[PDB]
Design a protein around this nucleic acid. Structure first.
Ligand SMILES: [Zn+2]
Ligand SMILES: [Zn+2]
Ligand SMILES: [Zn+2]
Ligand SMILES: [Zn+2]
Lengths: 70, 69
DNA sequence: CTAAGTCACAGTGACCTG
DNA sequence: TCAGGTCACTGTGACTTA
């Protein structure tokens, strides 16, 4: 009930079942809406305030890991 | 056939002293004063489908391959 | 030819509507 | 309150001009 469970940025509220920022909220929104994300490395990127935009594959992976649901 | 020295995509021509696709050419141009951060460990596999994801490793490779500002 | 500009296009997220 | 939209901002790269 404070920080984003996905990128650890200031979370706005409870979105999709986890406390998240508007960024991760919108991201999951679109991801479940319809999109192929490609990880530029080893499917183990560090998702945070300044890396979430870089890897969409690991960001989505994390969205699910932390509990977000459709 | 020529391939982009940075991302292996079909190169458009010889840009900045190296063979590059239009993407890496414009990117390099834009970069030269952007400071980037790799999402992983600075060893990304930069190709057509991932060059947009890591900008740090893209610019790294731009210099590595000999692109001159 | 390449350098350099151009601009439609697509993702992001802060804000808005329901 | 949150889901789902929205749209200005921005980076991209294919194409145009010099
Ligand atoms: Zn977040
Ligand atoms: Zn990744
Ligand atoms: Zn390239
Ligand atoms: Zn990288």
């Amino acid at each position: 009930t404070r920080y984003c469970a996905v990128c650890n940025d200031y979370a706005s509220g409870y979105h999709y079942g986890v406390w998240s920022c508007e960024g991760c909220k919108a991201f999951f929104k679109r991801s479940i809406q319809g999109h192929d994300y490609m990880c530029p490395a080893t499917n183990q990127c560090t998702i945070d305030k300044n890396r979430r935009k870089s890897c969409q594959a690991c960001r989505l992976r994390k969205c699910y890991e932390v509990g977000m649901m459709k």
